[PDB]
Amino acid sequence: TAILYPFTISGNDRNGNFTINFKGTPNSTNNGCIGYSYNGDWEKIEWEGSCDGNGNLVVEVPMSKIPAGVTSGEIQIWWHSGDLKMTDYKALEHHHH
Numbered sequence: 465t466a467i468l469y470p471f472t473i474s475g476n477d478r479n480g481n482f483t484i485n486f487k488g489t490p491n492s493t494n495n496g497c498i499g500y501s502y503n504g505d506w507e508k509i510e511w512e513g514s515c516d517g518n519g520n521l522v523v524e525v526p527m528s529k530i531p532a533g534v535t536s537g538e539i540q541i542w543w544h545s546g547d548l549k550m551t552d553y554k555a556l557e558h559h560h561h
């Protein structure tokens with residue numbers, strides 16, 4: 465039961481990380497990706513992790529994994545053993561709550 469969150473980025477700036485905060489069922493098992501179209505073809509930077517006792521999960525990916533010229537994509541949740549939602553993401557110095 466996939467969940468998709470669209471995003472837009474600069475095509476040029478690639479310093480730092482793409483950081484995602486999720487809230488979900490404590491101790492849940494979760495995975496997904498950061499996906500994007502690269503010259504029309506879909507590529508995926510997979511992520512996985514378990515929520516802590518408070519139900520929080522932070523995912524970090526280097527921005528350098530997204531090729532130059534890419535301007536849009538989706539944060540995707542794939543597997544979630546309980547509940548999971550994106551509460552914030554940060555890329556290229558910009559938070560999105």
Ligand SMILES: OC[C@H]1O[C@@H](O[C@H]2[C@H](O)[C@H](O)[C@H](O[C@H]3[C@H](O)[C@H](O)[C@H](O[C@H]4[C@H](O)[C@H](O)[C@H](O[C@H]5[C@H](O)[C@H](O)[C@H](O)O[C@@H]5CO)O[C@@H]4CO)O[C@@H]3CO)O[C@@H]2CO)[C@@H](O)[C@@H](O)[C@@H]1O
Nearest residue numbers: 465466467468493494495496497499506508538540542543
């Ligand atoms: O460890 C937990 C659990 O994992 C189990 O195996 C999982 C596995 O870990 C993954 O969760 C896997 O994930 C697949 C998803 O179920 C789903 O099919 C997903 O589909 C994506 C697709 O990959 C792609 O990103 C697609 O992007 C679109 C985009 O949305 C946009 O429309 C654009 O224009 O087009 C692109 C391309 O079409 O979006 C889809 C989501 O809608 O793909 C995942 C794999 O890449 O599922 C497995 C379960 O079947 C087991 O190992 C288990 O034992 C273990 O407990």
